[PDB]
Design an enzyme around this catalytic site. Sequence first.
Site, PDB file in Angstrom:
ATOM      1  N   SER A   1       0.792  -1.233   0.000  1.00 11.37           N
ATOM      2  CA  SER A   1       0.000   0.000   0.000  1.00 11.37           C
ATOM      3  C   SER A   1       0.834   1.297   0.000  1.00 11.37           C
TER       4      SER A   1
ATOM      5  N   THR B   1       0.267  -6.744   1.578  1.00  7.12           N
ATOM      6  CA  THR B   1      -0.526  -7.501   2.556  1.00  7.12           C
ATOM      7  C   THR B   1      -2.019  -7.333   2.338  1.00  7.12           C
ATOM      8  N   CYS B   2      -2.441  -6.095   2.129  1.00 10.92           N
ATOM      9  CA  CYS B   2      -3.845  -5.776   1.906  1.00 10.92           C
ATOM     10  C   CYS B   2      -4.577  -6.522   0.765  1.00 10.92           C
TER      11      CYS B   2
ATOM     12  N   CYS C   1      -7.160  -6.819   3.442  1.00 10.82           N
ATOM     13  CA  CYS C   1      -8.388  -6.133   3.147  1.00 10.82           C
ATOM     14  C   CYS C   1      -9.203  -6.852   2.108  1.00 10.82           C
TER      15      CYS C   1
ATOM     16  N   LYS D   1     -10.196 -10.454   2.879  1.00  9.94           N
ATOM     17  CA  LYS D   1     -10.919 -10.392   4.142  1.00  9.94           C
ATOM     18  C   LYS D   1     -12.360  -9.981   3.876  1.00  9.94           C
TER      19      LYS D   1
ATOM     20  N   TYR E   1      -2.363  -4.013 -10.910  1.00  8.07           N
ATOM     21  CA  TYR E   1      -1.331  -3.248 -10.240  1.00  8.07           C
ATOM     22  C   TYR E   1      -0.021  -3.265 -11.004  1.00  8.07           C
TER      23      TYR E   1
ATOM     24  N   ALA F   1      15.381  -6.905  -1.470  1.00  8.24           N
ATOM     25  CA  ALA F   1      16.373  -5.857  -1.234  1.00  8.24           C
ATOM     26  C   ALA F   1      16.972  -5.852   0.165  1.00  8.24           C
TER      27      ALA F   1
ATOM     28  N   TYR G   1      -8.968  -6.591  16.270  1.00  6.27           N
ATOM     29  CA  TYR G   1      -9.854  -6.617  15.116  1.00  6.27           C
ATOM     30  C   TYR G   1      -9.724  -7.856  14.198  1.00  6.27           C
ATOM     31  N   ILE G   2      -8.500  -8.296  13.924  1.00  6.63           N
ATOM     32  CA  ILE G   2      -8.304  -9.451  13.049  1.00  6.63           C
ATOM     33  C   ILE G   2      -8.949 -10.674  13.667  1.00  6.63           C
TER      34      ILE G   2
ATOM     35  N   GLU H   1     -12.668 -10.500  13.568  1.00  8.44           N
ATOM     36  CA  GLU H   1     -13.137 -10.706  12.202  1.00  8.44           C
ATOM     37  C   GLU H   1     -13.071 -12.164  11.786  1.00  8.44           C
TER      38      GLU H   1
ATOM     39  N   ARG I   1      -7.324 -12.999  26.837  1.00  8.74           N
ATOM     40  CA  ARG I   1      -6.702 -12.875  28.156  1.00  8.74           C
ATOM     41  C   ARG I   1      -7.519 -12.087  29.173  1.00  8.74           C
TER      42      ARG I   1
ATOM     43  N   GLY J   1      -0.777 -10.791  16.995  1.00  6.64           N
ATOM     44  CA  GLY J   1      -0.016  -9.583  16.704  1.00  6.64           C
ATOM     45  C   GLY J   1       0.602  -9.576  15.326  1.00  6.64           C
TER      46      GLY J   1
ATOM     47  N   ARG K   1       2.020   9.237  -0.143  1.00  9.03           N
ATOM     48  CA  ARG K   1       1.533  10.302  -0.998  1.00  9.03           C
ATOM     49  C   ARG K   1       2.027  11.638  -0.457  1.00  9.03           C
TER      50      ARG K   1
ATOM     51  N   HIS L   1     -34.489  10.097   6.575  1.00 12.54           N
ATOM     52  CA  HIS L   1     -35.410   9.149   7.178  1.00 12.54           C
ATOM     53  C   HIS L   1     -35.998   8.246   6.102  1.00 12.54           C
TER      54      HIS L   1
ATOM     55  N   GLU M   1     -29.332   8.653  10.529  1.00  9.08           N
ATOM     56  CA  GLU M   1     -30.103   9.796  11.025  1.00  9.08           C
ATOM     57  C   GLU M   1     -30.076   9.964  12.555  1.00  9.08           C
TER      58      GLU M   1
HETATM   59  N1  LIG Z   1     -41.563   4.870  17.854  1.00  6.09           N
HETATM   60  C1  LIG Z   1     -40.093   4.612  17.812  1.00  6.09           C
HETATM   61  C2  LIG Z   1     -39.356   5.292  18.959  1.00  6.09           C
HETATM   62  C3  LIG Z   1     -38.999   6.748  18.667  1.00  6.09           C
HETATM   63  C4  LIG Z   1     -40.190   7.575  18.172  1.00  6.09           C
HETATM   64  N2  LIG Z   1     -39.958   8.987  17.826  1.00  6.09           N
HETATM   65  C5  LIG Z   1     -38.531   9.305  17.667  1.00  6.09           C
HETATM   66  C6  LIG Z   1     -37.889  10.123  18.790  1.00  6.09           C
HETATM   67  C7  LIG Z   1     -37.404  11.500  18.299  1.00  6.09           C
HETATM   68  N3  LIG Z   1     -38.453  12.256  17.609  1.00  6.09           N
HETATM   69  C8  LIG Z   1     -38.280  12.919  16.462  1.00  6.09           C
HETATM   70  O1  LIG Z   1     -39.211  13.540  15.917  1.00  6.09           O
HETATM   71  C9  LIG Z   1     -37.078  12.462  15.630  1.00  6.09           C
HETATM   72  N4  LIG Z   1     -37.877  11.345  15.156  1.00  6.09           N
HETATM   73  C10 LIG Z   1     -37.438  10.154  14.752  1.00  6.09           C
HETATM   74  O2  LIG Z   1     -36.381   9.635  15.151  1.00  6.09           O
HETATM   75  C11 LIG Z   1     -38.646   9.312  14.365  1.00  6.09           C
HETATM   76  C12 LIG Z   1     -38.373   7.830  14.198  1.00  6.09           C
HETATM   77  S1  LIG Z   1     -39.761   6.885  14.925  1.00  6.09           S
HETATM   78  S2  LIG Z   1     -40.429   5.637  13.461  1.00  6.09           S
HETATM   79  C13 LIG Z   1     -39.722   4.015  13.914  1.00  6.09           C
HETATM   80  C14 LIG Z   1     -38.504   4.135  14.842  1.00  6.09           C
HETATM   81  N5  LIG Z   1     -37.513   5.037  14.247  1.00  6.09           N
HETATM   82  C15 LIG Z   1     -37.242   5.061  12.938  1.00  6.09           C
HETATM   83  O3  LIG Z   1     -37.591   4.163  12.159  1.00  6.09           O
HETATM   84  C16 LIG Z   1     -36.207   6.094  12.503  1.00  6.09           C
HETATM   85  C17 LIG Z   1     -34.918   6.055  13.314  1.00  6.09           C
HETATM   86  C18 LIG Z   1     -33.914   4.986  12.872  1.00  6.09           C
HETATM   87  N6  LIG Z   1     -32.622   5.195  13.563  1.00  6.09           N
HETATM   88  C19 LIG Z   1     -34.425   3.604  13.233  1.00  6.09           C
HETATM   89  O4  LIG Z   1     -34.482   3.335  14.452  1.00  6.09           O
HETATM   90  O5  LIG Z   1     -34.762   2.821  12.312  1.00  6.09           O
HETATM   91  C20 LIG Z   1     -37.988   2.755  15.306  1.00  6.09           C
HETATM   92  O6  LIG Z   1     -38.786   1.828  15.520  1.00  6.09           O
HETATM   93  N7  LIG Z   1     -36.776   2.801  15.870  1.00  6.09           N
HETATM   94  C21 LIG Z   1     -36.042   1.654  16.421  1.00  6.09           C
HETATM   95  C22 LIG Z   1     -35.696   1.669  17.938  1.00  6.09           C
HETATM   96  O7  LIG Z   1     -35.961   0.674  18.634  1.00  6.09           O
HETATM   97  N8  LIG Z   1     -35.322   2.829  18.495  1.00  6.09           N
HETATM   98  C23 LIG Z   1     -34.965   4.059  17.770  1.00  6.09           C
HETATM   99  C24 LIG Z   1     -34.464   5.149  18.712  1.00  6.09           C
HETATM  100  C25 LIG Z   1     -35.547   6.174  18.967  1.00  6.09           C
HETATM  101  N9  LIG Z   1     -35.619   7.224  17.950  1.00  6.09           N
HETATM  102  C26 LIG Z   1     -35.013   8.372  18.625  1.00  6.09           C
HETATM  103  C27 LIG Z   1     -34.171   9.345  17.793  1.00  6.09           C
HETATM  104  C28 LIG Z   1     -33.428  10.348  18.679  1.00  6.09           C
HETATM  105  C29 LIG Z   1     -32.138   9.750  19.230  1.00  6.09           C
HETATM  106  N10 LIG Z   1     -31.116   9.530  18.154  1.00  6.09           N
HETATM  107  N11 LIG Z   1     -39.426   9.854  13.270  1.00  6.09           N
HETATM  108  C30 LIG Z   1     -38.940  10.736  12.403  1.00  6.09           C
HETATM  109  O8  LIG Z   1     -37.753  10.766  12.071  1.00  6.09           O
HETATM  110  C31 LIG Z   1     -39.954  11.195  11.423  1.00  6.09           C
HETATM  111  C32 LIG Z   1     -41.130  11.864  12.108  1.00  6.09           C
HETATM  112  C33 LIG Z   1     -42.246  10.891  12.456  1.00  6.09           C
HETATM  113  N12 LIG Z   1     -43.174  11.483  13.469  1.00  6.09           N
HETATM  114  C34 LIG Z   1     -42.917  10.422  11.160  1.00  6.09           C
HETATM  115  O9  LIG Z   1     -43.836  11.126  10.688  1.00  6.09           O
HETATM  116  O10 LIG Z   1     -42.497   9.363  10.630  1.00  6.09           O
HETATM  117  N1  LIG Z   2      -7.573  -2.784  -9.182  1.00  5.31           N
HETATM  118  C1  LIG Z   2      -8.850  -2.024  -9.038  1.00  5.31           C
HETATM  119  C2  LIG Z   2      -8.816  -0.696  -9.785  1.00  5.31           C
HETATM  120  C3  LIG Z   2      -8.180   0.434  -8.977  1.00  5.31           C
HETATM  121  C4  LIG Z   2      -6.814   0.063  -8.391  1.00  5.31           C
HETATM  122  N2  LIG Z   2      -6.120   1.062  -7.563  1.00  5.31           N
HETATM  123  C5  LIG Z   2      -7.007   2.150  -7.123  1.00  5.31           C
HETATM  124  C6  LIG Z   2      -6.815   3.503  -7.812  1.00  5.31           C
HETATM  125  C7  LIG Z   2      -6.353   4.593  -6.828  1.00  5.31           C
HETATM  126  N3  LIG Z   2      -5.165   4.201  -6.066  1.00  5.31           N
HETATM  127  C8  LIG Z   2      -5.014   4.380  -4.750  1.00  5.31           C
HETATM  128  O1  LIG Z   2      -3.982   4.020  -4.154  1.00  5.31           O
HETATM  129  C9  LIG Z   2      -6.320   4.565  -3.972  1.00  5.31           C
HETATM  130  N4  LIG Z   2      -6.503   3.124  -4.009  1.00  5.31           N
HETATM  131  C10 LIG Z   2      -7.656   2.457  -3.976  1.00  5.31           C
HETATM  132  O2  LIG Z   2      -8.734   2.920  -4.387  1.00  5.31           O
HETATM  133  C11 LIG Z   2      -7.343   0.969  -4.056  1.00  5.31           C
HETATM  134  C12 LIG Z   2      -8.528   0.075  -4.363  1.00  5.31           C
HETATM  135  S1  LIG Z   2      -8.003  -1.224  -5.538  1.00  5.31           S
HETATM  136  S2  LIG Z   2      -8.497  -3.003  -4.678  1.00  5.31           S
HETATM  137  C13 LIG Z   2     -10.019  -3.504  -5.556  1.00  5.31           C
HETATM  138  C14 LIG Z   2     -10.736  -2.321  -6.223  1.00  5.31           C
HETATM  139  N5  LIG Z   2     -10.975  -1.263  -5.237  1.00  5.31           N
HETATM  140  C15 LIG Z   2     -11.332  -1.511  -3.973  1.00  5.31           C
HETATM  141  O3  LIG Z   2     -11.752  -2.614  -3.593  1.00  5.31           O
HETATM  142  C16 LIG Z   2     -11.498  -0.281  -3.086  1.00  5.31           C
HETATM  143  C17 LIG Z   2     -12.387   0.799  -3.689  1.00  5.31           C
HETATM  144  C18 LIG Z   2     -13.891   0.567  -3.506  1.00  5.31           C
HETATM  145  N6  LIG Z   2     -14.637   1.778  -3.914  1.00  5.31           N
HETATM  146  C19 LIG Z   2     -14.354  -0.588  -4.375  1.00  5.31           C
HETATM  147  O4  LIG Z   2     -14.327  -0.398  -5.609  1.00  5.31           O
HETATM  148  O5  LIG Z   2     -14.726  -1.651  -3.822  1.00  5.31           O
HETATM  149  C20 LIG Z   2     -11.958  -2.776  -7.054  1.00  5.31           C
HETATM  150  O6  LIG Z   2     -11.930  -3.854  -7.668  1.00  5.31           O
HETATM  151  N7  LIG Z   2     -12.765  -1.771  -7.408  1.00  5.31           N
HETATM  152  C21 LIG Z   2     -13.988  -1.896  -8.213  1.00  5.31           C
HETATM  153  C22 LIG Z   2     -14.042  -1.151  -9.579  1.00  5.31           C
HETATM  154  O7  LIG Z   2     -14.397  -1.769 -10.596  1.00  5.31           O
HETATM  155  N8  LIG Z   2     -13.501   0.072  -9.659  1.00  5.31           N
HETATM  156  C23 LIG Z   2     -13.067   0.901  -8.523  1.00  5.31           C
HETATM  157  C24 LIG Z   2     -12.617   2.288  -8.970  1.00  5.31           C
HETATM  158  C25 LIG Z   2     -11.108   2.374  -9.003  1.00  5.31           C
HETATM  159  N9  LIG Z   2     -10.506   2.704  -7.711  1.00  5.31           N
HETATM  160  C26 LIG Z   2     -10.131   4.109  -7.876  1.00  5.31           C
HETATM  161  C27 LIG Z   2     -10.242   5.040  -6.663  1.00  5.31           C
HETATM  162  C28 LIG Z   2     -10.037   6.505  -7.057  1.00  5.31           C
HETATM  163  C29 LIG Z   2     -11.322   7.116  -7.605  1.00  5.31           C
HETATM  164  N10 LIG Z   2     -12.372   7.264  -6.544  1.00  5.31           N
HETATM  165  N11 LIG Z   2      -6.547   0.467  -2.952  1.00  5.31           N
HETATM  166  C30 LIG Z   2      -6.454   1.094  -1.784  1.00  5.31           C
HETATM  167  O8  LIG Z   2      -7.370   1.771  -1.311  1.00  5.31           O
HETATM  168  C31 LIG Z   2      -5.522   0.422  -0.847  1.00  5.31           C
HETATM  169  C32 LIG Z   2      -4.117   0.350  -1.412  1.00  5.31           C
HETATM  170  C33 LIG Z   2      -3.863  -0.921  -2.208  1.00  5.31           C
HETATM  171  N12 LIG Z   2      -2.651  -0.775  -3.074  1.00  5.31           N
HETATM  172  C34 LIG Z   2      -3.829  -2.112  -1.245  1.00  5.31           C
HETATM  173  O9  LIG Z   2      -2.744  -2.383  -0.686  1.00  5.31           O
HETATM  174  O10 LIG Z   2      -4.898  -2.743  -1.052  1.00  5.31           O
END
Ligand SMILES: NCCCCNCCCNC(=O)CNC(=O)[C@H](CSSC[C@H](NC(=O)CC[C@@H](N)C(=O)O)C(=O)NCC(=O)NCCCNCCCCN)NC(=O)CC[C@@H](N)C(=O)O
Ligand SMILES: NCCCCNCCCNC(=O)CNC(=O)[C@H](CSSC[C@H](NC(=O)CC[C@@H](N)C(=O)O)C(=O)NCC(=O)NCCCNCCCCN)NC(=O)CC[C@@H](N)C(=O)O
Lengths: 461, 461
Positions: free
Chosen positions: A13, A40-41, A46, A49, A97, A113, A180-181, A184, A201, A273, A330, A450, A455
Site C-alpha cells: 500500500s 498484505t492488503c 483487506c 478479508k 497493479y 532488497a 480486530y483481526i 473478524e 486474556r 499480533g 503520498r 429518514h 439519522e
Molecule cells: N416509535 C419509535 C421510537 C422513537 C419515536 N420517535 C422518535 C424520537 C425522536 N423524535 C423525532 O421527531 C425524531 N424522530 C425520529 O427519530 C422518528 C423515528 S420513529 S419511526 C420508527 C422508529 N424510528 C425510525 O424508524 C427512525 C430512526 C432509525 N434510527 C431507526 O431506528 O430505524 C424505530 O422503531 N426505531 C427503532 C428503535 O428501537 N429505536 C430508535 C431510537 C428512537 N428514535 C429516537 C431518535 C433520537 C435519538 N437519536 N421519526 C422521524 O424521524 C420522522 C417523524 C415521524 N413522526 C414520522 O412522521 O415518521
Molecule cells: N484494481 C482495481 C482498480 C483500482 C486500483 N487502484 C485504485 C486507484 C487509486 N489508487 C489508490 O492508491 C487509492 N486506491 C484504492 O482505491 C485501491 C482500491 S483497488 S483493490 C479492488 C478495487 N478497489 C477496492 O476494492 C477499493 C475501492 C472501492 N470503492 C471498491 O471499488 O470496492 C476494485 O476492484 N474496485 C472496483 C471497480 O471496478 N472500480 C473501482 C474504482 C477504481 N478505484 C479508484 C479510486 C479513485 C477514484 N475514486 N486500494 C487502496 O485503497 C488500498 C491500497 C492498495 N494498493 C492495497 O494495498 O490494497
Amino acid sequence: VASYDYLVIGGGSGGLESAWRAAELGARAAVVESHKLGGTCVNVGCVPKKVMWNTAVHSEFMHDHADYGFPSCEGKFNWRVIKEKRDAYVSRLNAIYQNNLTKSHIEIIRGHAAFTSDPKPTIEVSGKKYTAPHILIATGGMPSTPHESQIPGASLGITSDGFFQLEELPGRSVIVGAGYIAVEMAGILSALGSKTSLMIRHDKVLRSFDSMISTNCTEELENAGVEVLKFSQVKEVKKTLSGLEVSMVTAVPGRLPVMTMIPDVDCLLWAIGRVPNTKDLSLNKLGIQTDDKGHIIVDEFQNTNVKGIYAVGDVCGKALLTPVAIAAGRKLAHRLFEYKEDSKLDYNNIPTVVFSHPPIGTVGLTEDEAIHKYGIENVKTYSTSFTPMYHAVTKRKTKCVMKMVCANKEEKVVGIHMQGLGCDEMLQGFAVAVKMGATKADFDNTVAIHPTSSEELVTLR
Amino acid sequence: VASYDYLVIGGGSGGLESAWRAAELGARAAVVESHKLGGTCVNVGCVPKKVMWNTAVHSEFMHDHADYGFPSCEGKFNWRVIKEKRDAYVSRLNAIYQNNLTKSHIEIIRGHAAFTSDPKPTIEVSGKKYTAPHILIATGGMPSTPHESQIPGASLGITSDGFFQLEELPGRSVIVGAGYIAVEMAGILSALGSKTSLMIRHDKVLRSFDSMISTNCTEELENAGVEVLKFSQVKEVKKTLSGLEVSMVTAVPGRLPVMTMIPDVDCLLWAIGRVPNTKDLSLNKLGIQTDDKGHIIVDEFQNTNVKGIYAVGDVCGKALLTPVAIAAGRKLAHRLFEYKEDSKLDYNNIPTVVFSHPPIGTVGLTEDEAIHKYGIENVKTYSTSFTPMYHAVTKRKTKCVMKMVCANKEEKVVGIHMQGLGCDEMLQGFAVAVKMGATKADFDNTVAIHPTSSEELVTLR
Ligand SMILES: NCCCCNCCCNC(=O)CNC(=O)[C@H](CSSC[C@H](NC(=O)CC[C@@H](N)C(=O)O)C(=O)NCC(=O)NCCCNCCCCN)NC(=O)CC[C@@H](N)C(=O)O
Ligand SMILES: NCCCCNCCCNC(=O)CNC(=O)[C@H](CSSC[C@H](NC(=O)CC[C@@H](N)C(=O)O)C(=O)NCC(=O)NCCCNCCCCN)NC(=O)CC[C@@H](N)C(=O)O
Ligand SMILES: Cc1cc2nc3c(=O)[nH]c(=O)nc-3n(C[C@H](O)[C@H](O)[C@H](O)COP(=O)(O)OP(=O)(O)OC[C@H]3O[C@@H](n4cnc5c(N)ncnc54)[C@H](O)[C@@H]3O)c2cc1C
Ligand SMILES: Cc1cc2nc3c(=O)[nH]c(=O)nc-3n(C[C@H](O)[C@H](O)[C@H](O)COP(=O)(O)OP(=O)(O)OC[C@H]3O[C@@H](n4cnc5c(N)ncnc54)[C@H](O)[C@@H]3O)c2cc1C
C-alpha cells in the site's frame, strides 16, 4: 549501481502510492518487490478479508428469509467455490497493479532488497546495486506467532495468512486473540458454520476501543454463537488422532485457576499480533534506528535518522491500516518531489472500521482519551442504543449503539463510535466532518435522512 | 372556546415535533388529529415503504446465493406474511406516538378541525371551539389522481396509500409516474415478482435530479427487469374480464404516435403527484393565502399572511420530506416559545435518499443548478463509476456512480450525487460536511476507510 530519483522498497500500500505520486511529479522511480504486488492488503488482507465477510453477511441473512416471506433454505455452504473466486479476484488485481506501474514508467526490481556497506545509502537486489537520493522503506510487517519454547506446539496452528490458504471450512475453530483481526476471523468462521471459540486474556475484546464498543462487541459475539473464553490462554498444543488438543489456563480474578483441554480442534489460529518486517534489510549497516521490537523509528515527516531514507506503513508501527500507509507515501512524495516542506500526515482522527457482525465504525477520541486530554468537567458524551427497523419483523436481533464524545463548551465533536448494520459505509462522511472540526451544533443543524440508522447521529439529544 | 398557548392542526411529522418542542418550553399545547397519529410517513409512507424495501432487497440477494457458495432457493414469496407484520409495526408505533404526547402533557383534540368566522383566529373541532395566540397548520397533502373527465377510467387505479392496502402481490403491475415514489413502487413490486412497467412522459426518471442520476436510474431500472415505457401516457382505462386494459399513447419525438393496449393489468398505480390538504380547513374565512394549487403560502419564518397562524410540511409545497417538516416545526417552536427571532430552517443542502435498487443519495446543487448560479467557468465536477467489490464474484451486477460538483477556486463542494449499494446509510455524514461548507481539499484530507464504497468520495481525482 543504477541511479534513480526514488527507490521504494516494497510494493504494498505505502510503497506503491508513494512511487505513483513521485512518478507523476517527474521522478524516475523503481519499486523493489520480493513477492506479489499489492502487498498484505490485496494478497492477505483487506481484499480477501472483505470478500469472505460479504459471504458471512450472506449466511447471516439466510436466517431472516422466512421472516421476510420467503421459504427457508436447507443449508450446507461450500467453501471451495467462494475460495476459487476470491483467489481469482486477487489475481485480476495483481495484473492491474502491474499494468499501472508499467504505464506510469515505474521500474520494478523484482527480488529481495537489503542495504549495503557503501557509505552513500545503497541497496542491493540480487547481487546488483541500486542507489538514490531518496529511498523509502515500506516493507510492512507479518503475523507474529509464539515460540515453541514457551508454548510447546504453538507452531501447530495457523495465522491470518494461513486462513487465506484454507481450502475447506474448519469444523471446530479456536482463535486466540482479542483485536480486530481476531474478531473478524471469529465472526466469519462462526457465521459460515464453524464451531468457533475466541480465546482472550481478559473479559472483553477490542479493549483499546471506546468502552461502549468493547462491551457491545463482546456481547454481539456471544449472541451470534461465538464462544468467548475469557481470562484464558494457551498453555500447549498437541496433534491427536482427530485434530489438535488445546490446553488453556483460565485465571478469572477472584477464583483459582483451572486447566482445560479443548479437543478435536481442526483450526487453531494465532491472531495475537503483527511484527515488523525489518531484519534482513540489514538496517545495522547504516545505523538506521528501530525500537526494541524492530519497528523503524521515523519522525513526523517520516524521516529515519539517516538522510535520504524514510519509512511508511506497518513497518513503523503506527496506525496499521492501508489508507494510513497510502496517505503517508503520498504526502512524502509531495514533500520530496513537489518541495512542500510541510507535507506530513496528521495521525489524529483516522477513521477505522472493523468488519464484525454488526460492523464497527470509529473515529477520534474515546471517552477516556477525551477525559484525559480535557478533564471530566469538560467532556460531554451523547449516546443512543436501538434496534434497526430491519429487525422490526425478525426473530433475530442485533443492536445499534452510537456514542458521541464532545469537548469544551462549544462541544467540538472529538469522537464518534458506533456498532450496527450499515456502520461500515456510514462512517466516511462523519470522519470528514469530524476532521473539519465540527461541533454538536453542526450535526444538529443538518437535516436528517429518514428512515436510516445514520439519522440517529444528527438527532442525538 | 378553550384557550391554549399552542394549537397545532395535524399530528403528522411537522405538527407532532412542533408540539413536542413547544411543550418542552412551557407552552400548554394540544394537537388536532382527524385520523392516525404519525401522519403520512408512519401510516402510508416512510415506515411501511422502507419495510417493503428491506423485503425487496432480500429477493434481490436471493439471486446471489449460489455465487456465494450457498445452494439456491425454489422461490415463491408470500406477501401476506410480510404485510401482517408491516401493519403490526405501524400499530406499535401509533401506540408509542400516543404515549409520548400524553407523557408530555400535550392534549389531543381528536377529529377534523376547520377555521371559523370569529375575528380572532379560532378553529372548531366537532362543534366545539379552540383558539390560541399561535396556531400551526400542519395538515400535509395527499396523492393526486386524474379526473374521469380527461382520463376516463382513471379512478379504476390505486395510489401509494392503496399500495399499502394491497393484500396479495399484483401479478401484472403498471405504474404511471417518474418521481421517487413511482420509482420506489416499481422497484419493490418488480423485485418481489410482479411483471412491472413504469410509464413516463419522457425518456428518463427523476428528471429533476442530477443528469448522472436520472440517466443511471433509468438504466438500472431497465437492467432489473422493469419495463420503462417512455414518452407514453394513459389515454383511458377499462375493467375487462381479467384485470384492467390500459390504453396509452406513445409520442416519441421524430416519430408518429401509436396507441397501445396493455391488457390483463391487475394493478394500475397513479404515482403522479401530491396535492395539499387545505380545502375543508376553511382558509377562506381568514383570507389565508394559498397558491393556485391550494398550497398555503408562508415566508422564511413559516408565517402565513395572518398573524398567529403558520404552516409547515407538505401543506406548503416546499421539500416534501418528513425531516423538513420536523425541522420546520422544531425551529418554529423555538422562535415562538424560546423567543429566538432568527430561528428559521435553511432549505439549502437538504439531503435526500431514494430507496431504489441501488439506493440514491443526493445533497446540494446539481451540475446545472451550479452552472447556473456560478457560471461554466467556475464549476468543476469530479466523478467516478465502478462496480462494488460485492459484485466481484456475482454474475449479477449493479454499478456505483458518484459525482461531486465544486464551485469557484477554493472548490467548495456544492453537491454530491451518487447511486449504488450502501448509498442510503452513506449520505448523512457528507451532508453534514457539505452543510459545514467543505471544500474538495477537506474531503481529500480525510483518510479513507478501506475497503468501502464511501472511500471513493475522499479519493476523487
Ligand atoms: N416509535 C419509535 C421510537 C422513537 C419515536 N420517535 C422518535 C424520537 C425522536 N423524535 C423525532 O421527531 C425524531 N424522530 C425520529 O427519530 C422518528 C423515528 S420513529 S419511526 C420508527 C422508529 N424510528 C425510525 O424508524 C427512525 C430512526 C432509525 N434510527 C431507526 O431506528 O430505524 C424505530 O422503531 N426505531 C427503532 C428503535 O428501537 N429505536 C430508535 C431510537 C428512537 N428514535 C429516537 C431518535 C433520537 C435519538 N437519536 N421519526 C422521524 O424521524 C420522522 C417523524 C415521524 N413522526 C414520522 O412522521 O415518521
Ligand atoms: N484494481 C482495481 C482498480 C483500482 C486500483 N487502484 C485504485 C486507484 C487509486 N489508487 C489508490 O492508491 C487509492 N486506491 C484504492 O482505491 C485501491 C482500491 S483497488 S483493490 C479492488 C478495487 N478497489 C477496492 O476494492 C477499493 C475501492 C472501492 N470503492 C471498491 O471499488 O470496492 C476494485 O476492484 N474496485 C472496483 C471497480 O471496478 N472500480 C473501482 C474504482 C477504481 N478505484 C479508484 C479510486 C479513485 C477514484 N475514486 N486500494 C487502496 O485503497 C488500498 C491500497 C492498495 N494498493 C492495497 O494495498 O490494497
Ligand atoms: C488480516 C488482515 C486483514 C486486514 N484488513 C485490513 C482492512 O480491512 N483495512 C485496512 O485498512 N487494513 C487492513 N489490514 C492492514 C493492511 O494490510 C496493512 O496496514 C497495509 O497492508 C500496510 O501497508 P505497507 O505499505 O506498510 O505494507 P505491505 O502491504 O505489507 O507491503 C510491503 C510489501 O513489501 C514486500 N517486501 C518486504 N520486505 C521487502 C524487501 N526487503 N524487499 C522487497 N520487497 C519486500 C512485501 O512482500 C510486501 O509485498 C489487514 C491486515 C491483515 C493482515
Ligand atoms: C409513499 C410515500 C412514501 C414516502 N417516503 C418518504 C421517505 O422515505 N422519507 C421521507 O422523508 N418522506 C417520505 N414521504 C414524505 C413524508 O410522508 C411527508 O413529507 C411527511 O409526511 C410530511 O409531514 P406533514 O407534517 O406536513 O404531514 P403529515 O404526516 O401528512 O401529517 C398531517 C396529519 O394531519 C392530519 N390532518 C389533515 N387535515 C387535518 C384537519 N383539518 N384536522 C385534523 N387533522 C388533519 C392528517 O390525517 C395527518 O395525519 C413519503 C410519502 C409517501 C407518500
